[PDB]
């Protein structure tokens, strides 16, 4: 709807029928997610952070259902402290930054 | 304005005169920068993300000029790769993250 940038902008999601509570990170290229089992159709990936680089696993065209829409998009699985959805899922949802 | 997230929401802001091309990040709490001589009046903070932790030198009451908006803020200094604008100054400019 709108999100005031006062409280962190977390949302509960379903990353292929599996419930995960997520952050809307607009400083994120991607979306990450620890604690899920996507398949075996991954790709060894590296993503950098604010304190450095990690390795994720990259599963294409994952069903995802958040905010009352369905999206199939590209989820990485690595050790993210918080599960983040990036500019990649924000534009599927059809969010922006309104000033 | 408006920001769509097919491109990362980068723009130029002013930290007492010094422009730094920044990223508007709903995933940051606080606004972290690199390559800014602010003061010798700071408190060394530490913040973590993806890849862990960096140490910052948090500075308080710090005027910023971004997107034709003029504000005073808290931003840190540290070895952040890209200049990040956390929410702290996302709610000063008074942004929202809208569907």
Swiss-Prot record, chains A, B:
Active-site feature positions: 25
Coiled-coil segments on the chain, per record: none
Ranges of residues in domain Peptidase A2: 20-89
Region listing for Dimerization of protease, in residue ranges: 1-5, 49-55, 88-99
Domain of life, source organism: Viruses
SUBUNIT field: Homodimer, whose active site consists of two apposed aspartic acid residues.
Function: Aspartyl protease that mediates proteolytic cleavages of Gag and Gag-Pol polyproteins during or shortly after the release of the virion from the plasma membrane. Cleavages take place as an ordered, step-wise cascade to yield mature proteins. This process is called maturation. Displays maximal activity during the budding process just prior to particle release from the cell. Also cleaves Nef and Vif, probably concomitantly with viral structural proteins on maturation of virus particles. Hydrolyzes host EIF4GI and PABP1 in order to shut off the capped cellular mRNA translation.
Protein's name according to its UniProt entry: Protease
Source species of the chain: Human immunodeficiency virus type 2 subtype A (isolate ROD) (HIV-2)
Name of the gene encoding the protein in the UniProt record: gag-pol
Span covered, complete protein: 514 to 612 of 1464
């Amino acid at each position: 709807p709108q999100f005031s940038l006062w409280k962190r902008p977390v949302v509960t999601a379903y990353i292929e029928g599996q419930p995960v509570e997520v952050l809307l990170d607009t400083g994120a290229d991607d979306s990450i997610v620890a604690g899920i089992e996507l398949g075996n159709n991954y790709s060894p990936k590296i993503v950098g952070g604010i304190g450095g680089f990690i390795n994720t696993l990259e599963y294409k065209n994952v069903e995802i259902e958040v905010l009352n829409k369905k999206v199939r998009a590209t989820i990485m699985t690595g050790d993210t402290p918080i599960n983040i959805f990036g500019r990649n899922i924000l534009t599927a949802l059809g969010m922006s930054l309104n000033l």
